[PDB]
Write a protein that binds this ligand. Structure first.
Ligand SMILES: [Ca+2]
Length: 150
């Protein structure tokens, strides 16, 4: 069982209190994987924002099947004092070998203005197309399968 994630940095704007980005999850192995077994983590510094809410903009199987929770990290490291963990509900479906979700655009919103230039998972060089951003991590059943942590 293996997966990859590809990533495009959001438009930039506009609104300084919104992190926007789009990911695509691909099954690169030889067996089907249920979406409900997959987690994606986006690692960042919340910059004093105590509240950080996740919103899913669009997903092919429905935005009501994408869940996000944002958690503070106890032992913070450079580039991450907070991560957003994206997961799927049991009815999101499954990815056959070679299958991919296509674009899932999302946003993380705060009450104050983020500085995305000190966020580990941010890569401003991937604005114009999807790239392989290995500063975003992904898991199958809680085992790391893509990217490099923290
Ligand atoms: Ca930050």
């Amino acid at each position: 069982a293996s997966i990859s994630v590809s990533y495009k940095c959001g438009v930039k704007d506009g609104t300084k209190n919104t992190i926007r980005a789009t990911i695509n999850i691909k099954n690169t192995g030889t067996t089907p994987v249920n979406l409900s077994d997959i987690k994606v983590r986006y690692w960042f510094t919340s910059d004093g924002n105590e509240q950080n809410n996740f919103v899913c903009d669009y997903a092919a199987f429905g935005t009501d099947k994408v869940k996000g929770i944002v958690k503070k990290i106890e032992n913070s490291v450079p580039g991450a004092d907070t991560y957003c963990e994206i997961s799927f509900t049991e009815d999101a479906g499954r990815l056959a070998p070679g299958g991919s979700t296509g674009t899932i655009p999302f946003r993380i919103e705060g009450a104050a203005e983020y500085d995305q230039t000190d966020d580990y998972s941010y890569n401003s060089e991937m604005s114009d197309d999807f790239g392989d951003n290995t500063k975003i991590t992904a898991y199958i059943k809680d085992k790391l399968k893509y990217g490099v942590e923290a």
